[PDB]
Paper text:
Olfaction, or the sense of smell, is initiated by the stimulation of odorant receptors (ORs) by odorants. Several subtypes of the human OR52 family, including OR52A5, OR52B2, OR52E1, OR52E8, and OR52L1, are known to recognize carboxylic acids, and the consensus OR52 (OR52cs), representing 26 members of the human OR52 family, is also responsive to carboxylic acid odorants.
Structural comparison highlighted the high similarity between Gαolf and Gαs particularly in the C-terminal α helix, which is a major GPCR binding site.
Numbering used by the authors: 41 to 72, 74 to 310, 312 to 374
The structure:
């Protein structure tokens, strides 16, 4: 029979990217929609460079250009920043290429947590040479990193080994949550995606609430929802690669945002192949934040299945979603 899964989670957690991985592994890619994602990807390139140059002078302390000759380039991006009907000429990409080379732009980028920057910014700025081509055809990875806000309820159906899987993609930001109750129809499991990398960042709806705290507070609402007593949650502790990069950078300490982290220790009861202990301790702590919520209530009527996920790694999502189907079988 058909298993109906529901992706819940805060904004920009990675739910839509999970479906995109399902369209890579169990349906044949994307229909040629697509070729319009080029516009969405180019909007990301425009959004990233616009957000960084506007932040260089509003961050405290501010960041100047490393080369004063780049001033006319920053003046160009500020003039095209509000234009919604942008043409995307080569002049745009030529300035973005040399602006990203300016160390001041990189310096402002490394402080991105002090403003709102999409997580695909570094990837597309580092892949500007391809995106600027006239015959630029997006890679599957380019399509995974493409960020578009989800409004409404998007449905995706696929089957693996002759069993059907209906998947519901929803919007994560606060105003989209109002419609979530409509998706509570005939749900076999819930896939809650949480952005573990965003422990030092704030959400976009108010620029005040901590993003990881938003996921934790939202996860408690789902777990302790009166209507969801029976429903179990498959917890995707997402963005492990971006989580490792900032733990290995050592600039934003988790303790600064979650003080109880100083006492948490890796439970002696197993890391991956040569995984840095700093990365290990970080991801197991974020897990114990959720597991603490889910162990407090439930009384055995439903359970929570955690997984470490990287929604942009096709091989990872294959492995994670593979034994997800095993969990559904044991539910029988
Ligand atoms: N590097 C990296 N990027 C990720 C990962 N998961 C998601 N992203 C990126 O984050 C961005 C936002 O992901 P998205 O799928 O739109 O989240 P969402 O939950 O659907 O966001 P919303 O629709 O509720 S607002 C995308 O550009 C995606 O590529 C990850 O595990 N690693
Ligand atoms: Mg979405």
């Amino acid at each position: 029979a058909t298993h109906r899964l529901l992706l819940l989670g805060a904004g920009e957690s990675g739910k839509s990217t999970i479906v995109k991985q399902m369209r890579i592994l169990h349906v044949n890619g994307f229909n040629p929609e697509k070729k319009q994602k080029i516009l969405d990807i180019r909007k990301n390139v425009k959004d990233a460079i616009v957000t960084i140059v506007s932040a260089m002078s509003t961050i405290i302390p501010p960041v100047p250009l490393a080369n004063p000759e780049n001033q006319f380039r920053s003046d160009y991006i500020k003039s095209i920043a509000p234009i919604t009907d942008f043409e995307y000429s080569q002049e745009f990409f030529d300035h973005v290429k040399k602006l990203w080379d300016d160390e001041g732009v990189k310096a402002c980028f490394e402080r991105s947590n002090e403003y709102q920057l999409i997580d695909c910014a570094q990837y597309f700025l580092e892949r500007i040479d391809s995106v600027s081509l006239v015959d630029y055809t997006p890679t599957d990875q380019d399509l995974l990193r493409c960020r578009v806000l989800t409004s409404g309820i998007f449905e995706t159906r696929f089957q693996v080994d002759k069993v059907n899987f209906h998947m519901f993609d929803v919007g994560g930001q606060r105003d989209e949550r109002r419609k979530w109750i409509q998706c509570f129809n005939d749900v076999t499991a819930i896939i809650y995606v949480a952005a573990c990398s965003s422990y030092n960042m704030v959400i976009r709806e108010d620029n005040n609430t901590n993003r990881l705290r938003e996921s934790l507070d939202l996860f408690e609402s789902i777990w302790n929802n009166r209507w969801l007593r029976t429903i179990s949650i498959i917890l995707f502790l997402n963005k492990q690669d971006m989580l490792a990069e900032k733990v290995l950078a050592g600039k934003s300490k988790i303790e600064d945002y979650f003080p109880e982290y100083a006492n948490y220790t890796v439970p002696e009861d197993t890391p991956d192949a040569g995984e840095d202990p700093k990365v290990t301790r970080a991801k197991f702590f974020i897990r114990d934040l959720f597991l603490r919520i889910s162990t407090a209530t439930g009384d055995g009527k439903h359970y929570c299945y955690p997984h470490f996920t990287c929604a942009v790694d096709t091989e990872n999502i294959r492995r994670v979603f593979n034994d997800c189907r095993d969990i559904i079988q044991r539910m029988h």
